[PDB]
Design an enzyme around this catalytic site. Sequence first.
Site: not given
Length: 129
Positions: A35, A46, A48, A50, A52, A59, A101
């Site tokens: 990562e 990203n 969209d 957003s 990271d 994110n 989650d």
Amino acid sequence: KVFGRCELAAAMKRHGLDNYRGYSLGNWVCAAKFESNFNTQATNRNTDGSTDYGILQINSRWWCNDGRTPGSRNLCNIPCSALLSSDITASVNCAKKIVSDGNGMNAWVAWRNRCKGTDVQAWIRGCRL
Ligand SMILES: [Cl-]
Ligand SMILES: [Cl-]
Ligand SMILES: [Cl-]
Ligand code: NA
């Protein structure tokens, strides 16, 4: 800070990630390698809009607030900049919420594509723990 492989393994173990939700320590070290190349200051934007952040590339669409991702959530209740610190506590505490989650470590694309189903124990081989 750019961690060494065994240095990071030891920090992650001290912070409770060994076998957390069933994921052995090598899975977490492998994920961080691919990562962020073990660099706490890593950021990537990203499509969209957003971003990271940090050693585990958390994110802003869901997990932290960066002031520039409209309509996002802040489920870890932190500024995203807290995830770039040389102290990995904030990133680890947030990762624990993510991995709980329901989707496990599949939340991390690089883990799914480069660590899952491999011999992840090799990432902690030789380390003093
Ligand atoms: Cl392991
Ligand atoms: Cl925002
Ligand atoms: Cl799981
Ligand atoms: Na956010």
